[PDB]
Amino acid sequence: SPMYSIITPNILRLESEETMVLEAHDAQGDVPVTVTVHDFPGKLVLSSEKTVLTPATNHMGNVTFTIPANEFKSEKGRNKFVTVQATFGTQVVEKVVLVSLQSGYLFIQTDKTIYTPGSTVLYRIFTVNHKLLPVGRTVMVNIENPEGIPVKQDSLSSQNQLGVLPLSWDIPELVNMGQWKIRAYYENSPQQVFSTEFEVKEYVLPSFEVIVEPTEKFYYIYNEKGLEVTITARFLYGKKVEGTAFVIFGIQDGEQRISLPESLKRIPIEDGSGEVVLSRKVLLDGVQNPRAEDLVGKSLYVSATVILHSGSDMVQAERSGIPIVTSPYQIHFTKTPKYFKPGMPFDLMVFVTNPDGSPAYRVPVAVQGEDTVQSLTQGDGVAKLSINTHPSQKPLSITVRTKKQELSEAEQATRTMQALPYSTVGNSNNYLHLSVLRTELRPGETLNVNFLLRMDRAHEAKIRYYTYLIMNKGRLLKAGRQVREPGQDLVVLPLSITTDFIPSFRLVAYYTLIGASGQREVVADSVWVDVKDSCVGSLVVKSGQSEDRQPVPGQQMTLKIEGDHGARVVLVAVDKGVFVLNKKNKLTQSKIWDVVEKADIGCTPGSGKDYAGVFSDAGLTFTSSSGQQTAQRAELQCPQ
Amino acid sequence: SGIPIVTSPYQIHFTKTPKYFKPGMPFDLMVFVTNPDGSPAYRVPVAVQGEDTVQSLTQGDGVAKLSINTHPSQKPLSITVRTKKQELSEAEQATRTMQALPYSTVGNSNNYLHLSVLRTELRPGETLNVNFLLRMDRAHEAKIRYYTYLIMNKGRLLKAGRQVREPGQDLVVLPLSITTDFIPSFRLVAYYTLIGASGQREVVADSVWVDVKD
Amino acid sequence: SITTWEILAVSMSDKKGICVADPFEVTVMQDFFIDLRLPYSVVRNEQVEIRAVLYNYRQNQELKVRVELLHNPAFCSLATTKRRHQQTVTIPPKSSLSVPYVIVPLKTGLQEVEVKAAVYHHFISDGVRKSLKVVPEGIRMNKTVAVRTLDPERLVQKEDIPPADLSDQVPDTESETRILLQGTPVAQ
Amino acid sequence: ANNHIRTVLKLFRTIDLDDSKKSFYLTAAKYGIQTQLREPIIRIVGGYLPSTKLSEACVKNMISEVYEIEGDFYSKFSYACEDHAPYSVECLEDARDDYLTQLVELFKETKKCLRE
Ligand SMILES: *[C@@H]1O[C@H](CO)[C@@H](O)[C@H](O)[C@H]1NC(C)=O
Ligand SMILES: *[C@@H]1O[C@H](CO)[C@@H](O)[C@H](O)[C@H]1NC(C)=O
Ligand SMILES: *[C@@H]1O[C@H](CO)[C@@H](O)[C@H](O)[C@H]1NC(C)=O
């Protein structure tokens, strides 16, 4: 009784290439296959892209199609579904999948970050699709007042513009101040909107940047020395500043800011560096709660005002978010799988972070039990830990604690997790572990997964291959077999990681046997791998000259751009005084990758309650003619 | 001096590859692609002659981690490593062959041990996870409870320990703390011991060479 | 402008993807230069102070600047088409200096202010022309003319909005009137 | 030196551009010449021994070429530019780039006059 399976992304998209991997396990001879998609309910958006399966490919194929968007725009407030009904020879299998309206991203770039009234606004609107490629679509833009009333409306097409839409606006003279907003959204999907904020203010450009970085990015509550903050001031163009600097400290809880009257100090800066300390007596007396412990959680904030001895220019710089904490580390379980397998290593990805949020570097972690295990964090703040598991059904209570030296035991950071066992089909004890290296992988270097297996010797001849899939950015990227000769128990599959795998790929896998009374079963696994976040291509700007540095104003210089052939670059030069005055709402690769990762369908970093759970966690939909099919999804976001 | 006149821009070396393997279990090839003068080649796509769809890319230090599975057979295994860099004619690719004989058990009892391990430029301080992979039929699986391991560094037993293995599992991961005492290499040996056949004592061992950044 | 430009490049390639280069900074700087300091706006007929800040970045050379405020028909200051305003100052090395100027704006619009230097015994100069806004004395207030609800059947509907009084409007000042239309959705 | 400096400055006062032309154009042209052809020249000349002699002949050729180059820039700004309205600031900005480019080319070529 051969099976026929369809594996498709859990939520479909409009006007994009969506892949549906087709397998026919234990099938003899060629089988025609036709895939048709119909609207749900009712009945034919597309019925094209049929295929012929051959044993030359080991009976595996993929059918890619792009569903037209039309019936789709009539109703949007309630989720809409489509039915993917495919016929394998004379056997028909169908599955209802959700369809989203999101079709691409709009990254808005404004040249400056603060404008004065009577000055023109120059901004661009990049148009890219889910795969980060230029697309031709129609956009709408509305520029909002501080109160939120549109002031300008426009419609543009990205056709033949290579995904860049330069635009303009001349700010009216009589306008309200404060944050403005620019909201742009694709014309087909008006319920998803992207935005940026630019500030209209009365300003004249400053002359020098003031940096306040405390010695530690926190304040120990029991430290008797007080907060140690260093104020440094350098001119814009690279010279040291002489002046006098006022500073002040306060306690920032929730949204109310209270200042410390006994804290303002004048600390003259010589050679552009000054240091002031907030004695703990001041901190305790300023607040009305003498209990020092009850002050934890609240954040300090440093407001530094610098004036030159000329007295001609004044600049303000503020560093907030200095958390008052009793422990310098915060242990997170965001990346650790929440489900494990009996009798396998259970790789823990602990994420040791500083109290502010930045990743921690070179900190030893340990497990409270079996203290013989100890590790040390990598560059990105993830420490690989391995805990062997007894073959038992009881939930495993894993607690991890930081064991840094020269830190008192009443001062480390602790955390606890509950991990539940993978549940087989009818207690058959047929699992699959998929061991792998997880590090700051760079594109190009290979990876060796370990298709580890565990099953009784009575059924070691039925399994001869391992199917695997690779999610990335929301669509299947690669899908192939992995042959394994019977009698072999570990299989290493070399994976060629190109630059196309940025930033993460959710490798899955499965096999299929018949056992017990002769009922079909499926066993799956998942792995989340984090790749270093950089371009899929490469671009960098440097200077043509190799001599006679510090160009004088009015002098030609040549800047060299080393970009990929055929590409198009867009340039902008901003005075650094603007960033001194307001450094928020910039654009960089980090935010682009954050936005792309925030839209991934998968919603758990690997493993699951069982095979249906594993597939839904990955963001897939595995249905078969026999009946073993994944659970239905009808919500855009997985539960928090 | 030393500008060599050559007809091939790369030279494939098998200095670091183990010369013996285990039947039916992974065998890790460590090719050492080098420039004709002797410097380590960087970012060269090397591949095995058979199943040309498998290939890798050499890391910075000059070794490319290629893994090729093995059939459970006693016949000698032949490896034909063959670089396939682009912008080079097929007459320009450097080639090399090797023969690796199989591990021989005691009395053909089919007992093996394998220490699968990460192979990069380890830096002292970070941890390495070794996989004490075992192969044994369920006839005598209750007789093994631990794996003894030893560390050889600069001609001394750096750290000899144990690894308890609760019977019922066939893979256990032993975390190693790679301090600065491990410069530059350590030969992690391991073994167990059981009563097999008609009551004859026997021991099964393995070893791994790990290169740490110098 | 003597500052540090930050140049950002964003790629849009058809086949590969999208890139954003790390910002590249070129630090424009001169040996001896003026950095005139102006407020954003100075109210008409009210006296304000303008500072010219002269910099000298020779390691061990004392400098002898001769600053000067050219006459402008808009403002009012000591400069005149017959007599010129010159301070002959001395700048110690690696040191700043500040020169005070008092100017009374006289007419509205955007007006320019310039100072011209000329080093002695060497031949070096630098003058800066900066423009600052001048506005008539007053404050920004926005009185609501009227609010009304449109209902063609409960009130067609012929509606007229009388012009506002503008009793306190400052003369020769533009006034903007904004009209907003929003519907009233009903449900249930 | 100093006598050489006085001679060179006395020479860059003979230069004349038409007064009837627009004020911002005059400022643009004068600033271009003053920053690309009078600062490096004055810097180069300052580093001469007093006994060394200049060669004002092709310095007068410098002046002839700067008249011609300013004339070409003015012609390109007035009516040659077509993407924008005549006598408009964006035409000025578009033409100023290549004006300064040919001007620095002239200066680089004429750096050999300053000695015999
Ligand atoms: C199916 O996936 C393979 C992965 O190697 C790819 O080469 C092929 O183009 C895909 N099929 C289609 C129709 O795109
Ligand atoms: C034996 O080896 C261990 C390795 O950890 C070492 O700590 C110990 O000092 C050695 N000697 C004795 C007597 O334990
Ligand atoms: C007038 O302007 C203010 C800005 O301060 C803003 O609340 C709104 O636009 C108007 N408010 C009133 C009460 O007129």
Residue numbers in the entry:
A (entry chain A): 1 to 43, 45 to 71, 73 to 642
B (entry chain G): 322 to 535
C (entry chain B): 776 to 930, 935 to 967
D (entry chain D): 1 to 116
Extract from the study:
Albicin is a potent inhibitor of the alternative pathway of complement from the saliva of the malaria transmitting mosquito, Anopheles albimanus. Three distinct pathways of complement activation, the classical (CP), lectin (LP) and alternative (AP), are initiated by different sets of effector molecules but converge at the point of the proteolytic C3 convertase (C3bBb) of the alternative pathway which cleaves the scaffold protein C3 to form C3b.and anaphylatoxin C3a1. Here we describe the cryo-EM structure of albicin bound to C3bBb, the alternative C3 convertase, a proteolytic complex that is responsible for cleavage of C3 and amplification of the complement response. Albicin is shown to induce dimerization of C3bBb, in a manner similar to the bacterial inhibitor SCIN, to form an inactive complex unable to bind the substrate C3.
The dimeric C3b-albicin structure (class 4) was refined with C2-symmetry enforced, producing the highest resolution reconstruction of any of the 3D classes. The core part of the structure containing the macroglobulin domains MG1-MG7 of C3b is well ordered, while the complement C1r-C1s, UEGF, BMP1 (CUB) domains are covered by weaker density and the peripheral thioester (TED) and C345C domains are more poorly ordered due to their high flexibility. The symmetrical dimer interface is formed by interaction of the MG4 and MG5 domains from each C3b monomer (referred to as monomers A and B) as is seen in structures of C3bBb containing SCIN. In our map, density accommodating two molecules of albicin per dimer is located at symmetry-related positions adjacent to the C345C domains of C3b. The interaction surface of each albicin molecule contacts both molecules of C3b in the dimer. After particle subtraction using a mask corresponding to the TED, CUB and C345C domains of the dimeric C3b-albicin complex, the remaining core structure containing the macroglobulin domains of C3b and albicin from the C3b-albicin dimer structure (class 4) was refined using localized refinement with C2 symmetry enforced giving a map with local resolution of 3.1–3.5 Å at the C3b-albicin interface. The C3b binding region of albicin is comprised of portions of α-helices α1, α2 and α4 as well as the α2-α3 loop. The inhibitor sits in a groove between MG6 and MG7 of C3b (monomer A) which also includes the N-terminal part of the α-chain (αNT). The side chains of Tyr 31, Gln 34 and Arg 38 from α2 contact C3b residues in the region of Asn 738-Arg 740 in the αNT segment of C3b. Although generally similar in its binding site to that of SCIN, the contact points of albicin with C3b differ from those of the bacterial inhibitor due to surface differences in the two types of inhibitors. This result shows that the C3b-albicin dimer is sufficiently stable to be detected in the absence of FBb even though FBb binding strongly favors dimer formation as shown by size exclusion chromatography.
